[PDB]
Structures are given as structure tokens and as C-alpha cells.
Design an enzyme around this catalytic site. Sequence first.
Site, mmCIF file in Angstrom:
data_model
loop_
_atom_site.group_PDB
_atom_site.id
_atom_site.type_symbol
_atom_site.label_atom_id
_atom_site.label_comp_id
_atom_site.label_asym_id
_atom_site.label_seq_id
_atom_site.Cartn_x
_atom_site.Cartn_y
_atom_site.Cartn_z
ATOM 1 N N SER A 146 -31.173 -0.565 99.577
ATOM 2 C CA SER A 146 -32.335 0.375 99.670
ATOM 3 C C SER A 146 -32.140 1.346 100.870
ATOM 4 O O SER A 146 -31.003 1.901 101.041
ATOM 5 C CB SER A 146 -33.670 -0.380 99.741
ATOM 6 O OG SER A 146 -34.762 0.412 99.293
ATOM 7 N N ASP A 201 -32.698 1.845 88.057
ATOM 8 C CA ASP A 201 -33.294 1.712 89.376
ATOM 9 C C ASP A 201 -33.721 3.127 89.843
ATOM 10 O O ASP A 201 -32.928 4.061 89.740
ATOM 11 C CB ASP A 201 -32.259 1.117 90.317
ATOM 12 C CG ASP A 201 -32.692 1.091 91.759
ATOM 13 O OD1 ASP A 201 -33.842 1.445 92.061
ATOM 14 O OD2 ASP A 201 -31.871 0.692 92.643
ATOM 15 N N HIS A 258 -34.722 -2.261 90.979
ATOM 16 C CA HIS A 258 -34.272 -2.026 92.357
ATOM 17 C C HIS A 258 -34.162 -3.351 93.062
ATOM 18 O O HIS A 258 -33.370 -3.531 94.061
ATOM 19 C CB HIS A 258 -35.277 -1.138 93.062
ATOM 20 C CG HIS A 258 -34.873 -0.739 94.452
ATOM 21 N ND1 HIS A 258 -33.682 -0.119 94.696
ATOM 22 C CD2 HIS A 258 -35.456 -0.976 95.662
ATOM 23 C CE1 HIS A 258 -33.575 0.019 96.026
ATOM 24 N NE2 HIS A 258 -34.682 -0.471 96.598
#
Lengths: 269, 269
Positions: A146, A201, A258
Site C-alpha cells: 500500500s 485492486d 487490496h
Amino acid sequence: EVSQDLFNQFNLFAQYSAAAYCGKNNDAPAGTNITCTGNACPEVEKADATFLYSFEDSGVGDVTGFLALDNTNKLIVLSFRGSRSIENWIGNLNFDLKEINDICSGCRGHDGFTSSWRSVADTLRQKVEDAVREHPDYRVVFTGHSLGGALATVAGADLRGNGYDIDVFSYGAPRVGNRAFAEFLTVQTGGTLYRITHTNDIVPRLPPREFGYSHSSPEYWIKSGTLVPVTRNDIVKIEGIDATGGNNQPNIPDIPAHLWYFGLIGTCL
Amino acid sequence: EVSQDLFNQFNLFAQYSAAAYCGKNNDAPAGTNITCTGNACPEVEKADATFLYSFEDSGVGDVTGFLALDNTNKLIVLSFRGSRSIENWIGNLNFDLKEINDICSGCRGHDGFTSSWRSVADTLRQKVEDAVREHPDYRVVFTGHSLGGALATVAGADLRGNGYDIDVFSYGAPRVGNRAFAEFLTVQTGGTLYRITHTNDIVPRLPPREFGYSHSSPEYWIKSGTLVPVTRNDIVKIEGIDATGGNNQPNIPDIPAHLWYFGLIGTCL
Ligand SMILES: *[C@@H]1O[C@H](CO)[C@@H](O)[C@H](O)[C@H]1NC(C)=O
Ligand SMILES: *[C@@H]1O[C@H](CO)[C@@H](O)[C@H](O)[C@H]1NC(C)=O
Ligand SMILES: CCCCCCCCCCCC(=O)O
Ligand SMILES: CCCCCCCCCCCC(=O)O
Ligand SMILES: O=Cc1ccc([N+](=O)[O-])cc1
């Protein structure tokens, strides 16, 4: 579609990247074992793997993560945590570029990732350099999920070329800058970047290309679903800056996708 | 070990149980396709499965859940949701018994479970009875994870023997009352209870025996780890009221193991 050896690295650093959120260690003194809750990092637990330095809300970006020594795999790992609430982070995410000639010419990067990194750069470089000294034959790897992936990527671009290779494994990383940066990260020597994505994602799809952002090549695209196990056959190498037909497709994206890189990541059971 | 068919059933009702938390549901009209976020219930989404009736924070113990119709598998499924925050729920769990000769003489049940149910029984009975009338050939299944698992177990014990079999699939359920109530549950006909547990899940070890609780037999015990996929070999049928050597073993229990029955349950990505 990828080699077993590469699939194994990808899995290992997905777990080091998951450990930045889970497994307790708020002030875990240096040299203690790396462990996680919720079976988030069993391949790490299985290695002789210890903390060298833990950081938390460090500098202007409130950067968090750790540096570990792995005697089994012979690694020095700098792992950046992504955000403690990703849906929020995702909503508050500004798209402003800023010049970064310190790293490359005509290159603009994301203002928040760049500044966050820049603010912790000196202290962390020094910590990596020390380990590189005590273990010259260990591989230096920077990794993150991330935001953590953005940072790792930036930190890598920024500390390579000092005499030790730095490999970067990013998971679900957003775009970090403009086309000239994408290019710089596609070709830069002194290590490899492994930019891994999953299905649809949302995060690697931000900031949008329509705000000046590009992705470095290549992309390692995980096509198996959310909560599905990943094998080496579910990962496709997609070649080309802003290649489409991996994650960069015009379909509707998704947040849970994600949080599933090889296993659960960016959240702790 | 367990058959392929029974495994399939276990997987399916783990999903109908997960869907009570992760349904994009409720305030959703009857007849709507049942779907979940985060690949929480793909086997339900493949079925021609629709809501019959949705309930939220109903009666005395804020009961939440759904009644479903499934034309592919020929089911009428009442699925109860567990708590929105399992951790606080476990922390405030009260261990008081109340009598329930209503269900079986000499029976005492957990007081909050029996009263939350009791307070919505009449409505949900009429909803189930209605569906049984419209589809006399379909199998009636109640299911639930955690507190939801408790409620499905109580509702079943209460509603069996009115003409139609009621199977119950419970995942990570707490004990729901005294021995005698346990014993009823082990032998009662008009349906079967499949009482599924995982590794060292905390929740099925509460309320503790010491406070006057017992578990019904048999026990279906998943021994594959948290975040590990389950195969037929990982499931062990354990016989005996309060039998030990499945979930009921003398070690430190775990919340994350509570959240992994066949997949992610009790939380939504
Ligand atoms: C840390 O790990 C090493 C080997 O990987 C092990 O020998 C040692 O016992 C561990 N320390 C603790 C406190 O568990
Ligand atoms: C509901 O699912 C049925 C079959 O399972 C399908 O034919 C129909 O298109 C679905 N309705 C919607 C709105 O997707
Ligand atoms: C590199 C470490 C970055 C960790 C910063 C996370 C900050 C917590 C986030 C809480 C709110 C938000 O950013 O959505
Ligand atoms: C919605 C989050 C918490 C939901 C729990 C409500 C009913 C729980 C049953 C336990 C009664 C008790 O023993 O406290
Ligand atoms: O998909 C296999 C399958 C087997 C049994 C059942 N059931 O009895 O509901 C459902 C699905």
C-alpha cells in the site's frame, strides 16, 4: 507464469510486508524474534529473523515499519507499513506532484510519499548502511504494502547507487510519479523493483494517469481471487510503462482485493 | 475425516453464515439476489438464492440475520449474524443460566441467547413456516457463526418437531446451556446439528464448563490453520458430550482462529 524462485520471494516479502502491520512489537527491543498474530507471517517466523530497529509515526509522514535481520535467508529487510485505515487514506489521497531532481531529471513524484520518505531518509539510510557493514554478503531488500509499497519504492530509487544493491518488493503500491519517474524506475541499476499487483485492486490504479501519473515496468499481476491462494501459475509479468491488461484495466475496481496478497495483508485478524 | 458431499455442505453454510455480516443486504427487498463483499460467499452467489425476509436489531437482544430461499440447492436457510465486534462481545459475555423446560425439561440455557431468540421466535417461526408451506420439499437449515451460531442452535432446538426437519450448521458457536440441554441436542430427532469448530477458537470454549455448561456431541473440528484452506482430511469428527481433543483442549485460545472457517468469517474485507 512466474518461476518458483520468484514466487517464493514474492510470498516472503508479502509476509514481511504484512508483519509491518501485525505481530506485536510497538517498542520490541532490537534483536527480539519477529512474530505476528493471526498467522500473518509464518515464513518469516520460520526464519532466524530478528528486529534491528523499529520506527513509528516517524517524521513528517508518520512513517512506521522496521528493519530486520534474516540469517536464514541472508537478508537485511526494511519493511514499511501502509496506513492504519486504508479506506480513509484512500479517500484523503491528494494527487499533487512535486519536482524530484535529487533522484532524476524531469522527474516529478507524489508530494506526500516523497516528503514522507525525505523526512526519515537520513536516519534510515544510516541504519541500513550499518547492517550492510556487519553483513556484507546479505541481500538488502526494501518492501511494503500500500502506502508502504510507495515508500519502499521511493526509498529504493533514493538509496541505490551507494555500492550495495537494493531490491524492492512492493504490494498493491499506488503510482508514485510522472512518466519520467516510471522510466527511471523501469531502468535504474543497482537492484530490481518487483511491483506486484492483485486483480482489480484499486490502489495501484491511483493517483490516476489523468493526474500525470505513470507506472514503472514491469508489473507482476496476481490474477487469483480475493481469499484464494496464489500459485506461481496465477502471476503474469506484464511488460510496458502503463501497460493495460494486468491491473490497469477500465473495469470497476475493489478494496478487498487490496487486502489479499498471497494471504491477508494490511489488516490483522 | 468427512465426505465430499458433507464438506460441500460445510463450506456452503459457512458462507451463508459469513453472508449475515457481509451481505450488501438489509433494507434490501425480499426477492433480491443474495451477494457479499470481499468474495465472502461465492457459493451462495452461484446458487439461485434470494432473501425471503431480512431482520436487523430485532427484539430484545438486537437480533440480525436473514431468511433465504435457494432454488439450486433446494433450501430454506435462516442465517443468524454474530456480533459486530466479537472482541467486546466476548469481553462482556455474561454466564447466567435460565430455565427452558419449554424446549426440554431440566434444561437451562444461556440467558441472553435464549431471551434474544425467545423475543423474535414468533415472527421468525411464521416466516419459516410460511416458506416451508410454499416449498414443502425444500430442506430447512438454520446456521450461524459465533453468537449467530448460538441463536441457530437455540432456534432449532425450539422449533424442531413441528413437522419439518431443521438442520443446524454452527461455526465457532459458544456453549448454549447446561448438560441435559447438551444431551437433548445430541439425540433430538427432526434434524441434525453439525457443530463445527476450528483449531483453538476462543468462542466455543465459552461459557466455560465451570459455570455449568456442556457441549453437544458430535463435534466437527477443523485442524488446518488460520488462513489455510481446508480439505476433507483436516476435519475430524469427535464424539462425546464435552469431549476434549478437538477445540476443547488445554491450551491458549485465539481470536483469529475464530475468524477462519473455510474462509474469512465474522469480518468483511
Ligand atoms: C528466536 O528464534 C531462534 C531461532 O530462529 C530461536 O532459537 C529462539 O528460541 C527464539 N527466541 C524466542 C524468545 O522464542
Ligand atoms: C439474480 O440471479 C438470477 C439467477 O441466479 C439471474 O438470472 C438474475 O439476473 C439475477 N438478478 C440480478 C439483478 O442480477
Ligand atoms: C510508512 C508508514 C505509514 C503509516 C501511516 C498510517 C497513518 C495511520 C492512518 C490513519 C488515517 C489514514 O491515513 O487513513
Ligand atoms: C453488535 C455487537 C454485540 C452484539 C451482542 C448482543 C447480544 C450478545 C449476547 C450476550 C448476552 C450477554 O451475555 O452479555
Ligand atoms: O455443492 C455441493 C452441495 C452439496 C450439498 C448441499 N446441501 O445439502 O445443501 C449443497 C451443495
